[PDB]
């Protein structure tokens, strides 16, 4: 029921200096660290309250590690240029996400280590944490090399080791926010678009985590094709927002109910417009 993820982005930019390297760390839907090689003084920095308690050996070490990782990713951008026969005057991107999902018992469920080159799949560690999925011929060169170097076993050592252990720690230190039920504060609005019709919109605000279901029903059945859904969006305060909208014949509003599901709620809400 919990996960820790690191997202690394390396972007080349001929004429704009060395390639830029950005790393962000998440626990569930909460970001807790950041790194940016472009910063005046590049360091791993806190972006959540419960992480700031870590001592100098954590921030110094993560900073040195990010600076090291940035250089390796720059090396890797160059290697990829050779794999793909591409020009050094071109701009490219390496994206890597890795981390672990642990269950409610606190034990490892799945490990991750997958990547993309220029927005398309490159290479991914499989669920067995022992084989790879290379997405193209260039990535098959990498797969070939990583098998020899026993890379998967070392990824697996981290994912079973430090990853789950630090995740368990993070969950405990920030138990008051990371493990709290934050149900959406819901309401339904109404704006008649014409004489014939009117717009019903169901809001869900201030919820965590981001996972939510907003469905309209008419007489108890979903208007799946008629309902306009917006993408779940950050509020800016670590919470998320969403709204489902459906356009209905004015007078028949009461046939329509908005159904809200969230893990911060005791049981699923059923809403109606009220004046």
């Amino acid at each position: 029921s919990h996960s820790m993820r690191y997202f690394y982005t390396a972007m080349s930019r001929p004429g704009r200096g060395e390639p830029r390297f950005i790393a962000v760390g998440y626990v569930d839907d909460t970001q807790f660290v950041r790194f940016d090689s472009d910063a005046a003084s590049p360091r791993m920095a806190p972006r959540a309250p419960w992480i700031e308690q870590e001592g100098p050996e954590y921030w110094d070490g993560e900073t040195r590690n990010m600076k090291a990782s940035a250089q390796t990713y720059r090396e890797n951008l160059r290697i990829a240029l050779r794999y793909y026969n591409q020009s050094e005057a071109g701009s490219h991107i390496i994206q890597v996400m890795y981390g672990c999902d642990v269950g409610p018992d606190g034990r490892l469920l799945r490990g991750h280590d997958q990547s993309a080159y220029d927005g398309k799949d490159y290479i991914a560690l499989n669920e067995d944490l022992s084989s790879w999925t290379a997405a193209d011929t260039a990535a098959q060169i990498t797969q070939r090399k990583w098998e020899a170097a026993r890379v998967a076993e070392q990824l697996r050592a981290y994912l079973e080791g430090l990853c789950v252990e630090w995740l368990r720690r993070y969950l405990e230190n920030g138990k008051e926010t990371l493990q709290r039920a934050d149900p959406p504060k819901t309401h339904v609005t109404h704006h008649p678009i014409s004489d014939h019709e009117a717009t019903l919109r169901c809001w869900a605000l201030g919820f965590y985590p981001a996972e939510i279901t907003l469905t309209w029903q008419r007489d108890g059945e979903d208007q799946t094709q008629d309902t306009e859904l917006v993408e779940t969006r950050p509020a800016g305060d670590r919470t998320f927002q969403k709204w489902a909208a459906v356009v209905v014949p004015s007078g028949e509003e009461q046939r329509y109910t908005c159904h809200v599901q969230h893990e911060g709620l005791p049981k699923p809400l059923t809403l109606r417009w009220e004046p």
């Binding site: 790393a23 993560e62 590690n65 990824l155």
Partner: peptide
């Protein structure tokens, strides 16, 4: 905590 692994592709 991030992994320490300077890995070439």
């Amino acid at each position: 905590h991030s992994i320490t692994y300077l890995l070439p592709v």
